[PDB]
């Protein structure tokens with residue numbers, strides 16, 4: 001499988017990513033619908049992220065899960081690199097958040113389950129997704145959550161980063177559980193738990209784990225978030241304890 005630009009009809013712009021635009025597109029021979037991300041050779045070098053992208057592509061084509069976004073392949077011409085992507089009709093959870101303001105406990109729990117599964121499968125394959133955020137959470141046709149962008153994976157706004165990562169310290173799979181906590185809080189409250197107007201100060205909040213709950217947040221939710229957002233990685237739940245959780249299970253529509 002080696003592609004080229006003329007293999008595809010280019011469709012509407014889907015939106016800007018910080019390193020490239022995305023377009024709907026359709027492979028001419030099969031009429032297969034998909035997303036195509038146009039990245040520039042020049043911008044990629046300048047930031048020293050060209051090797052980062054190779055890592056991703058490599059990592060991605062090892063991965064297959066109903067709740068992870070497929071990468072079908074890649075290719076370059078002179079000026080640019082192209083990522084051939086599974087297309088996610090229902091857009092970002094980020095957009096659904098702004099549209100809805102905040103999610104109810106049923107949508108929240110379901111997403112956490114879908115994320116945990118997806119995250120749980122990744123861990124078993126020795127892979128960590130360093131920065132998960134609502135921008136990187138797409139929806140499928142049935143409304144399934146799909147994690148995007150492994151380009152940071154291993155082994156800008158700070159809201160979703162755990163202490164160990166911002167304190168310039170050493171990090172393990174326990175990173176992702178912090179991210180679950182931040183996401184879980186944000187879904188229910190409608191904005192992330194450390195959010196500030198400065199970087200320097202979001203830095204403090206995250207570092208001190210300094211957050212409080214609006215009053216409409218049930219004990220069950222507080223219990224899970226409180227357990228996920230722990231300063232010490234090793235104190236954070238197993239991905240399965242999350243999947244077991246009595247507020248997850250009482251609320252969630254999807255299996256585990």
Ligand SMILES: O=C(Nc1ccccc1)Nc1ccc(CCNc2ncnc3oc(-c4ccccc4)c(-c4ccccc4)c23)cc1
Pocket residue numbers: 014015016017019022035037039049052053056083085086087088089090091092136138148149150151152
């Ligand atoms: O970008 C990297 N890695 C990387 C890149 C450069 C340097 C280093 C690493 N990975 C990466 C990151 C993000 C993506 C997601 C690309 N959007 C998408 N990918 C697939 N289907 C999609 O469908 C949509 C869609 C948009 C609006 C309305 C309805 C549907 C999008 C979409 C595109 C831009 C913004 C918001 C959503 C979308 C894909 C890959």
